[PDB]
Design a protein around this ligand. Sequence first.
Ligand code: SF4
Lengths: 588, 92, 159, 270
Amino acid sequence: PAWQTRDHLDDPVIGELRNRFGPDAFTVQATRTGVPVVWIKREQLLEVGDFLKKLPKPYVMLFDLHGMDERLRTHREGLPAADFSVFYHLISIDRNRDIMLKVALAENDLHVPTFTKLFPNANWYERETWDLFGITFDGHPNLRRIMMPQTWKGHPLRKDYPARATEFSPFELTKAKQDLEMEALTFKPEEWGMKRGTENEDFMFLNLGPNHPSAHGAFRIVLQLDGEEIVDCVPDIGYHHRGAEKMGERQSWHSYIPYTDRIEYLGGCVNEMPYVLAVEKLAGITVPDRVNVIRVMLSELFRINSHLLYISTFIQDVGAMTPVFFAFTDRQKIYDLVEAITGFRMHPAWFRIGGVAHDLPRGWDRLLREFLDWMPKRLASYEKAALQNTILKGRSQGVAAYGAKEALEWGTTGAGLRATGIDFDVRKARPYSGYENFDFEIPVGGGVSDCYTRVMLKVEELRQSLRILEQCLNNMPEGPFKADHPLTTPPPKERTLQHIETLITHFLQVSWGPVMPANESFQMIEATKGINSYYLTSDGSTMSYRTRVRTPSFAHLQQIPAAIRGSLVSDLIVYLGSIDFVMSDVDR
Amino acid sequence: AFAIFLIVAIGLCCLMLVGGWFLGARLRLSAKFYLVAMFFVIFDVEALYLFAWSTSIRESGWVGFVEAAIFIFVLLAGLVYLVRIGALDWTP
Amino acid sequence: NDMVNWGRKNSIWPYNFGLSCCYVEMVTSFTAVHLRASPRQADLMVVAGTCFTKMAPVIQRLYDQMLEPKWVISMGACANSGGMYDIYSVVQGVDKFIPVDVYIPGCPPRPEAYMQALMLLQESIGKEQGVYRANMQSERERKRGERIAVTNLRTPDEI
Amino acid sequence: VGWGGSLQLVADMIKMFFKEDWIPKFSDRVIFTLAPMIAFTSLLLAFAIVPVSPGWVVADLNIGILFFLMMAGLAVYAVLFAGWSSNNKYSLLGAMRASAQTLSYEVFLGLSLMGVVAQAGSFNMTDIVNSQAHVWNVIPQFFGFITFAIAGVAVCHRHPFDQPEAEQELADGYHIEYSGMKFGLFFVGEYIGIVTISALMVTLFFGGWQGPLLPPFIWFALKTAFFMMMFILIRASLPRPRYDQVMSFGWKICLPLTLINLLVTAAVIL
Ligand code: SF4
């Protein structure tokens, strides 16, 4: 099965590292992540990573870097004695494989050498590890707090830190006056990054925080200006931090599902798919085929809606917005179908562990068929309106372009990375949710990623998604909407209303929570923006022990300073609009 | 007359303003390139001759149209000169 | 005469402070009901979205900037209270630090709810905060006999 | 519900009244007060040259055209002292770019008006209103009429759409630092501006006081109402044009058009 606990010791990378270093040091954990998890003492981490970086098929992209507390795990059979841990998820595209590296730390000596030299995108990741935990990374260039304000005492992801606001003092405005004094005295100490330029007439400091529309959330990007050039741009993020990861620790597996919908406001059921897939990987549940096709239908509908919003906003900011406002009416039709299936326009919270909340209502096929026959003529009107236009096309060529290597080092996935010559989708490389029974193509941009190429690729992907949605309408099979397994949460409701054992299972599942045995799962999907993943660790209880949400927008927003260096403020704003970043995703 | 209307307008201005009160260093690359406005400062002076011209043209006749064509041809030559040298172009 | 009161009911200027989420429905409403909205010119601020501890001074400066007659509409559960995010990083409602006049529950509310918010706000604006000894009547109490008399609803197996 | 279109503007004026006034720190005070009336009184006194009636003429002065051009040129000072009174380099540069496109697009109206005042041959408005007795001065001068239309809608009538916002970063629209009655003064000023541009257009291009079968003052009023509705229709239809495109279709395209327009009218008039 695809859920069984494997060691992955046979994997070639494990044997190459065993040959290179011989025996000892490496303890191969047993998990349901699908990838090989290896423990590597902190004094060899930089050596180990370097070996993997230059291996004859290298791990070019650091997918994720974060930490785990690990202090309260009672079931710790086989692991070394750790009070804290830091995990590094790496991916080799040429091998289409992954590797996870875990460095164990003790509570008195939370110190590890910085990993940013190998992979630059790790810099913010290590900063987050300094912010949310108390690990100090010696050798880090700018190790400051990236989420909480600079006077915030406490490391919020430690388990000795109370999670809920109720345990702290309420908003009595004792600290509001101090924040007011700080904001009124807005001066630059030159500690906000390298800030090599001095604060004088030579260099001008401008917050440049876009609160205008199409900004994709309110954020600040302190900018040093010289000759109207971007000398150094430093984002000030964390304003939209909702503590989703910490929230995952105090909620049951079933009642957390609503929280997934709000990592990305436009994603909806796309955000729910990786969570339910990871929880079912911990449960060992194989769903029926109808569940797979239903999930594919809802995810391609939400993907179509998000892509249409990205196209419309792009044509509005750098082009003529008169015709593309008709897409707003079209988006309403996609919404009337979602609330026909799920119930509510946004944040459906409709996916469940083992299936979906209800069956499809009997008039779904006629509405979907009317939308699928009506849409292609409009889609071709947008294709002519966007492929053939000249004014924005001339404007949108060579505007902060990057190549395959630049995207790889910066962890950038999605339409950004597909705009280069690397043919890498996860729906084909690692099929999930029954994508391997569908026929679709991956468009590609060639070798230059710019603003025109990304939108043309998004239109081609939207056409392939519409082909998937017609295949979902014509090949939806028959049978149940929920798996038959004691951990399917909740049970079918008609069975609950008549049968005592199903009633008892429903009783304990919705009240105490389902008991998932202690193990680790991990799922990644192609999201509306980039690759989104969920790394869940259970300690055997009815709540998550650790929830890690990898959002690509964090990496996409981290990438801007490497590419925008040597451009104007207008090119900056155009790039910010072009890049698929939403503040809710960056700050989770 | 005009004087009565001006007195009425300034009295209304005084009434509204009084009522309102009772009711209760270095620019670097920024700005510069006003030379479109300097082109206007010179071109308004050129067009003031046409402002004086427009009243009496029927008694001017053929030599009037001839040397008015010469005048606006000189202005057109200057305009295409400013365009082709790059003075009149995209401006901040 | 009450002509001054009529002036404010007929015309209002909205300052949209919708945040990351919850603003797509507000935009859906605004593009049907209505570049005019400008800072330091509006008298109505529709706070939407989750109010965070970090960015709360921004909302307090925008609240301070507007003129003496200040109206505030909280929309969504995330703005009325902390909503679902009872967490260290979210302040439990925008009403903690600024006075609020109208509360619009939902997550996100509907454009029709925005329409009913303007109707309840012109109703409050037409009785002079607008208590006036007439606002003790509540929507919980006004339509109570309307809501209780409902008996049958459509079965959810249909569209 | 309110049945009148103007009642919304009336309520807007009522709202702007009785609003507390704040003093701006680190700002000049005389121009902060004087900048509204440079935008208001200009198009208020642009109304002082209309022949609304031979017997109820507001001013029987010999020249009205030159006064109109004097108001057209004068209007820029309102955007300039507003920019300097903003006292914020952002807003000041926003008003500098707005005054840029303003001075850029104000050039055309005088040269477009030369055609009608040349085929009229006088500055006294009684001669113009008596000239359009059988044939209006719009059939031959289509290009001049549309050029004067573009110029009239380009003088701070919001068609350029760079007044309350800025396409360019590092700067901001200049209508932010005024929040008292002065903002209502701006709106009422552009309102009298659009109605006075429409009235001047009808009484200078078309034929005022004709009266085919009905009294001529309501004939003028109804024609002015039709041109009001058409102006609002095209103003709404007109999308926001970015700063660049406005600079592209400015001095390049319509200076030759008006020069050949003057050549055509001078060739056909004799
Ligand atoms: S009210 Fe709903 S849509 Fe609005 S911010 Fe809160 S969760 Fe998001």
